[PDB]
Amino acid sequence: PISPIETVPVKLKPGMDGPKVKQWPLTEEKIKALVEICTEMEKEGKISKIGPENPYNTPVFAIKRKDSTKWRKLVDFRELNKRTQDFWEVQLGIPHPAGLKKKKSVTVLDVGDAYFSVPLDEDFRKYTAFTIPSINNETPGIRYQYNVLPQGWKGSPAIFQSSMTKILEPFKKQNPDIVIYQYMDDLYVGSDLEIGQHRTKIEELRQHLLRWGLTTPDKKHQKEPPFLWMGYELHPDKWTVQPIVLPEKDSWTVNDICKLVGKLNWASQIYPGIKVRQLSKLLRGTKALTEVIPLTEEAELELAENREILKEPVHGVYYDPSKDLIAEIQKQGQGQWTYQIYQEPFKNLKTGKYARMRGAHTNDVKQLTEAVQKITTESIVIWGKTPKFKLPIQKETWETWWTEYWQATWIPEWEFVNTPPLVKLWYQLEKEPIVGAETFYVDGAANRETKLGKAGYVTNKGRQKVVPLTNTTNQKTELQAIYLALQDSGLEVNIVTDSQYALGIIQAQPDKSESELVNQIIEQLIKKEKVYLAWVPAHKGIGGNEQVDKLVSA
Amino acid sequence: SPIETVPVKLKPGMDGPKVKQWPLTEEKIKALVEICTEMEKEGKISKIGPENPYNTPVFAIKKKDSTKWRKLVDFRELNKRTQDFWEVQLGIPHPAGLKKKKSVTVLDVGDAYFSVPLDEDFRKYTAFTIPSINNETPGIRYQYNVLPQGWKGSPAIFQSSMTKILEPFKKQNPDIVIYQYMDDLYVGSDLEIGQHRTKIEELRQHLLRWGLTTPGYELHPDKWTVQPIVLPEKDSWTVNDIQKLVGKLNWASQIYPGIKVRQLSKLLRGTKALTEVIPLTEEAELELAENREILKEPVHGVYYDPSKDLIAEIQKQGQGQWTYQIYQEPFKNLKTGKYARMRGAHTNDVKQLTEAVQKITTESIVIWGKTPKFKLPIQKETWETWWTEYWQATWIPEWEFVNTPPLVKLWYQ
DNA sequence: TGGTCGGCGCCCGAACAGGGACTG
DNA sequence: CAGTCCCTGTTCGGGCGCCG
Ligand SMILES: C[C@H](Cn1cnc2c(N)ncnc21)OCP(=O)(O)OP(=O)(O)OP(=O)(O)O
Ligand SMILES: [Mg+2]
Ligand SMILES: [Mg+2]
């Protein structure tokens, strides 16, 4: 029914009044059910009629539920919400089946008319005023107001979760050895008791709840393995996600692509190797989520490959705190990666991906660490632990990069897993001039307001060159220039520069960039067996400098 | 019940802290929870709900193989919002007498602020939330009734009382300087460790039978120089070998408007082979030893203006090689130095970087009565991921992250 | 016909920000 | 100094998925 728990105090944003919008028309169907609900709600006390004295009103409606003769009465409190104070959302994320430890007994209860069991503070009620239209379009609609957490109000969620804990508090406190994963009104009760003794504790809990205004009707999973919880299927020794169907269609619109990626992203927690880069990339041109978009080959494929993975059935295991937590990552190409966290080989708890391209000039070791990060954070969130890693990168390639990178980078305890593709720096830079090597003095520039500009070089053995760039810029030149000094040189070269924009990009050993020019500068760098790049201050007349600028300054 | 909970207000038109709690470890939450449990059973904290829209992150950290967890709250975002309450109305006079102290000793006393009922109308700001492993339960919240450790006002409102608690031992040992920052209390003297340490042991017996309770640890930041910006010492110079000392001294010039260029710039006016050897003339060869003198002669343009915030820059060199650039103005380095890994087991990049933020900050306080605004050389996600692991200062400097190539490390290297 | 709320994930664009390079 | 450029990071919001 309705609970004696202490009502939570609620104020309105300084100097604001309640909502006063009218009830935009509703079908003769919805009305039939709203008045069917309200009668029950009013009779029960969850709401009360109100007269002229109440100067507020908000529009309401209803929805149907999955396989339910049941409707969901909602209220369009969009207006009130703005005018309502703001709260501190107490829900910090979501539980993951792969974090549950194996239990001897599991139960799942679901509180009934959840929100409608928790009272709304006496003084705020005035605003929750709404009106139920008449279908014969005559009688002035009936007006009521809430006396319990209304569905669709900005605050009810936080209040319900809050009260719920407060309600469970004593039970929890007196039955410390019993786990109770609560998410809104859904309760998963775990125990290491025998059927008998656990089923008794599951009863005491239920009663306590009822006694505290909370009903646990038979929607209560018992010898229900597989239990339905949080969108999974919880079996005695494995769990899996529920049927996750993708849409098979002819022509794709944008929101279609949104839905696809959405679900696929969701399946990537258990189905290993789902990838979406190409399918998503297909959504850069901001447009109507009704605008039909043409699929690219590189996407048509990854769609079908994915669509395939989703066919073999898969599942995941539960957590064993007495064992180590392992996570291994593999390179899926073009920035993408896939990983799985297991404890016993082949029996992984979870899987996941990483495809964020942080930066414009980075390599695969930068990304590989970007991932080890995500996987720690995440792994802490679920297990409150940090994994031991298995990585496709030489125990050396690493001691190379970090011991040579200007930034402090780190990786937790880890070991090498020779399971190519392997990760490696596609080339190095001599950090000491190369004897007998045409030393090139390179530079270039371009005019601010005009179109073009240019860049070129000169040698120490007598050689001169320059190229007329177009629409370039102060930077697009230094690079465009160091580009020639590569092809126009051989296995061993020594380029010199006064720009930092280019020495910086290149010193990071980047092997992937957004700009086509950069990529060419790398490609070449891989072919050479020795390259050195030193820097010297621009416009300070240094031996070899001025000549180059001149050839270009024009 | 005549207590005296001083009222406090936030700067003009400034809402309170509304920052999200970040992931912790089983070990940290089990502690953070065993703590709050106690803290509440003594009304220092009170469970609170969703209706309170303010929040601050919190966690714990171990200390000195004492295996004693200690809560900690990142009040940074509050201290920035808690009005000049601690600045324009209740400042702290620079006790520069510390810089010189032969042997200083840091001691955390804040474990006492918990005896000073905090203004109720303000408590509502001290809101913080503990989370759950794998998210089994919603966030359990709380509030402060007494004074929150690691808060700006917290040490202020209390110093009035502190001072008086000190007159006995503080008037009987005027030689010693006593400073208070945040939760910590610094005691600078000149006696040798043999007796100087035995004296701090007395400050204790004074403070414990007066309420307070506090469970090498010493310092002498002055008894360690700013390491100068050194140059090479060769007897054969290559083309780049020179072009380096040049470009280096080129920028190392802004820190000394007087530093010679041409004599060493003349040595090359054409496209020369980097490998090529080209020793110097006696003038430029005299410059190397001249411009070389200006690098033992402390810079000139430094004035500690308390009116602005101490920024800081840091560099990662090689094998535990980190460098300091504490300055308030560009090139106007008020103080620099370095930090290397000790003859103990080798740690990693971040573990050090952090220690090399605490040390630089500890000094910063003793030398200026405040903390910097570190420009960091690490990637946010990386920093924000492990930092809390290797920390132990009961305070937290503000900071930002910057990715900038070196060769500009040549100068401190 | 459609229309509500809170949490978290992903991805994209937009809006900032801050440096270094020039120019007035 | 401004007044701009480039360039690169970061934050915020929106759309979708999943949960109640
Ligand atoms: C109100 C709460 C959260 N919730 C669930 N769905 C919604 C929604 N569409 N809008 C707002 N809140 C929503 O629903 C819990 P729920 O279990 O979905 O429904 P109920 O009211 O508890 O009734 P029953 O037990 O018979 O299933
Ligand atoms: Mg329910
Ligand atoms: Mg140039």
Short mmCIF file of C-alpha atoms (C1' of nucleotides) and ligand atoms in Angstrom, two decimals, chain A residues 442-444 478 497-499 538 545 549, chain C residues 22, ligand 3:
data_model
loop_
_atom_site.label_atom_id
_atom_site.label_comp_id
_atom_site.label_asym_id
_atom_site.label_seq_id
_atom_site.Cartn_x
_atom_site.Cartn_y
_atom_site.Cartn_z
CA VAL A 442 64.72 22.62 -44.58
CA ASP A 443 62.02 25.28 -44.27
CA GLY A 444 59.08 26.93 -45.99
CA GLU A 478 57.55 22.90 -42.52
CA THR A 497 64.46 22.59 -38.52
CA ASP A 498 63.43 25.79 -36.67
CA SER A 499 59.73 24.93 -36.40
CA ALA A 538 64.20 30.69 -36.50
CA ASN A 545 69.24 28.75 -41.87
CA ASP A 549 64.09 31.01 -45.61
"C1'" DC C 22 52.69 35.95 -37.86
MG MG E 3 61.00 27.80 -40.64
#
